[PDB]
Amino acid sequence: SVLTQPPSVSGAPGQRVTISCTGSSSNIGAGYDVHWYQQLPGTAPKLLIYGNTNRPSGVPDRFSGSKSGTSASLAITGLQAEDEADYYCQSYDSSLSGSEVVFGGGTKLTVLGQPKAAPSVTLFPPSSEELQANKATLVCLISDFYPGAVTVAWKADSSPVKAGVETTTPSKQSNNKYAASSYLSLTPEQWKSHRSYSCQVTHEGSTVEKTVAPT
Amino acid sequence: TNLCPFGEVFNATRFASVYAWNRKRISNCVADYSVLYNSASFSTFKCYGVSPTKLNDLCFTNVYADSFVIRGDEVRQIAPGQTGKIADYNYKLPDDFTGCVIAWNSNNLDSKVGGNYNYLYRLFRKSNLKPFERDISTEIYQAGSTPCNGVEGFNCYFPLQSYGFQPTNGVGYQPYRVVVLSFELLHAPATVCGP
Amino acid sequence: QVQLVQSGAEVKKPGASVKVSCKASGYTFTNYGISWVRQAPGQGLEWMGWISAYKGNTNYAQKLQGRVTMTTDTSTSTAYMELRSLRSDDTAVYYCARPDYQVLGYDFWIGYYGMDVWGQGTTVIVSSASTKGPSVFPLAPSSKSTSGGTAALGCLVKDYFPEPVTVSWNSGALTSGVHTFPAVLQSSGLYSLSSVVTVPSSSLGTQTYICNVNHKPSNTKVDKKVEPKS
Amino acid sequence: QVQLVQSGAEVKKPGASVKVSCKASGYPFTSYGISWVRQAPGQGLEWMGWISTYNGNTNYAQKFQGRVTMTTDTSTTTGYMELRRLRSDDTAVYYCARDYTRGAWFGESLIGGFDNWGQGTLVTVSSASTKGPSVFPLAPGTAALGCLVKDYFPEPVTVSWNSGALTSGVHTFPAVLQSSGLYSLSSVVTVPSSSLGTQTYICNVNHKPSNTKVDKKVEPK
Amino acid sequence: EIVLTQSPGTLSLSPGERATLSCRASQTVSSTSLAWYQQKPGQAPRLLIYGASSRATGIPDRFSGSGSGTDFTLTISRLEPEDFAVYYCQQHDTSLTFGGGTKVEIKRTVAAPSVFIFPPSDEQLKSGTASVVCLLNNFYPREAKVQWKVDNALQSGNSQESVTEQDSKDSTYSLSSTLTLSKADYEKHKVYACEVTHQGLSSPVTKSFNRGE
Ligand SMILES: *[C@@H]1O[C@H](CO)[C@@H](O[C@@H]2O[C@H](CO)[C@@H](O)[C@H](O)[C@H]2NC(C)=O)[C@H](O)[C@H]1NC(C)=O
Ligand SMILES: [Cl-]
Ligand SMILES: [Cl-]
Ligand SMILES: [Cl-]
């Protein structure tokens, strides 16, 4: 994404939160407007703010936009449960390369409806049956966390590994806490050759690490 | 027998620098606007206070054709109520504008190998232009306190800048030829009518 | 009544092309343009390009270097997006949207304006299979150092398409401690999920544990015994 | 459709003037300038100048400045080119053309050229008086014979062989202008060697300007 | 002034072949201002191309213009018989000038001229002038050299020649040359010689007669 937003923000009902949108000399800094979109899970983006500060008919005045220099901000006052959504800033980038509509990476807003809960992490090594089929999957299962925002890092011994990592978006459990999973694909040779592999889950500034080794 | 010379305006070999935008007056002639509107040539034909499909049915006392080159992403500034280097310092339309803004990509004419730098715009000015004001002055711009006394130097700038139209530019940095038609209604006989 | 209705879900092989439609109603189609925006699963919005409806003038994202063609049919008020040489990272929901900008006449420069009307989206998945039954592997019971007396065991349900898969344990006899995780969509365009159950470690010698995987789309049923390994 | 029709051929003495007309039809006359181009026999195109049909503004090539006057009659949509103080090297076909190189109304450079050219007007400038030609024989596997059509003015002459019955092997050459100011032309035919003295060969010369017709029987000796 | 130089002077090609015509400017010419014209024999010029690359109303697709700066090109992709003609470029960037023109002529096999010399007629000699005529019949290509020799003395300044247009049947040229002398000068000399240089001959060919024989 060409514009930068925080991955997640949280506030209690009634509180005020801000979501930052930072651009550059070629988009926001070149005088191009910032628009904001609200995306509920499983729905098209909805226009929330247009021309930096304007609200469409249906959008309450609890939502306000601002733009200054190379950055913009969405402020939400008196947070309500229905404001829980992904928020995208959007602008226009004019350069010698081309003229493009550009977006921020999105901000997940949580309206805190329950106490914060650390993830429970279970890490499974490859099955002997999978290794026989000349494949190897490490399975990292992450449950009972709130808010529904985590980052997952994988380690081969003590060294990070980004190759062959597939991680789900957190989704609500029955108990309204969140679940996610991460899969590391290896060759049997990689699996057998290393001392261990670790799944590291970062939640609300805390880290849960689980490690498995060839038995 | 007496056709308005829109051909001469639209088919001119060279266009004016936007800071020194060219004005032509069209009077006492039959105008065919449909041939313009339906032209495959134009990527912008945006009007204010008049519907372009109604133009062949209307009479005006005069039509003014203002023409110049800007870059693609500045065509939006050629409209009522806009801000930016072009709207503020080069060519300003009034809020009550009655006319059409017509633009086409001129990369094939106004760009060349090693870039074309013949087209100028005003980069610096102490105050915004009034509607239909033209500033062709080349006085040194004082950005500081130390007197410039007619010479470029620290915080003392030549006020005009050249566009860099290289053929490989993105569309927003490619040259666009713009014709602004003003449809004038004076308390006088109409002279410029559709067929 | 102002709406954009997009064509249905597509599954395409790598190297193939897809043509998504976007039909406008409740407004004058040719008084606005159409912008295309896509969203990879769990990822952000990404603009692809716009078309001005009256003259059909287009502007495409540099990233889609001559792979994308946008057209309109004025007579059916329909916009089309064709994407060629599909690869895994083209897997996304594809949206058409209306930049909220009209003028008397026409104008190509529609990128500056907030998009007020959006289509419902079109899922495009790039996959070598448009239906495949899962390969089920046992996840042998494991106990952490902290909770030695409790064990987690499960089944890895690998490389199936499309959704959904159902997992039961011991033909529905075991429900307490069962957690079937939402599936990941791999870059291959195939799904994988895991089902785990937490049980007493003292049970692992005596109690049989079988996961019952049903994939109705492929009419595939797999029973996998999950045994302790040493 | 668009048509430019020019006035007929002119023969003038040195120091005289000529006024060529160019009648336009099939388009809006005052929307396009008129451009004038001349072509000397066997030479390239030479631009003479431009006139606006709208405001009567003119631009002439420096070579013709003070010697040429271009005008238009709007009511008859006709352009005129007057060239004065004529000399032998003004001998040329004079063309008018519908102009789209300079604007009739605003006089600025246009993306276009000269289209819908007139058929041209031949102007011949010469001291010479009308004179009929002298016809002399050109006496011969393959043999050649002909006749020399010498010391006539002005162009043209027609040559046929056996009243046009003989076309096979015939070449009538472009005339050359002698220093005398009179024209000279050759017409030849190739025939079987054996057909000499057994077949009759007559060249038929017509010079309409002098009302001169000559039939010359070409014999071998 | 802006001088337009066209090359080559002559293009020799066959129907169905591609013709590339060059127009070079002595200074930069705006591509808006470069035009191409066709002139068929005995006809007025016709606009083909304006603005360097735009084809005029009714001009076939096989004609295309390209180039910019000082280097312009007319391409005829597949020559029709009607395309064998002279082509002129034209600029109105600064004043208005034409190129010297390029002739597109029909290519055929090299053909040597058949050469004939004609003494002056007795009838002409009476009048006090002698015209000696040399015929070069049905040769290709057009390039040919006539040299007049009188008692082996090389003549200059006293001959004129002309060439026919390419023959519509056999695609050859023919050339006539007249040596003009007074009766007095003609009757001073014996040997009248026409010497012909042409690519169809392995060396120059001389046709001659002796005065009064
Ligand atoms: C500018 O010049 C062009 C080129 O001559 C004109 O285009 C012609 O336009 C007419 C009328 O629409 C068409 O019938 C022809 O087919 C076009 N000719 C060519 C060669 O393309 C155009 O009309 C001129 N512009 C104006 C406003 O008069
Ligand atoms: Cl903007
Ligand atoms: Cl326990
Ligand atoms: Cl000149």
mmCIF file of C-alpha atoms and ligand atoms in Angstrom, chain C residues 147-150, ligand 3:
data_model
loop_
_atom_site.group_PDB
_atom_site.id
_atom_site.type_symbol
_atom_site.label_atom_id
_atom_site.label_comp_id
_atom_site.label_asym_id
_atom_site.label_seq_id
_atom_site.Cartn_x
_atom_site.Cartn_y
_atom_site.Cartn_z
ATOM 1 C CA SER C 147 -0.218 -29.143 31.316
ATOM 2 C CA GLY C 148 1.298 -32.696 31.085
ATOM 3 C CA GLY C 149 -2.042 -34.335 32.126
ATOM 4 C CA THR C 150 -3.862 -32.753 29.084
HETATM 5 CL CL CL F 3 -4.102 -31.120 32.582
#
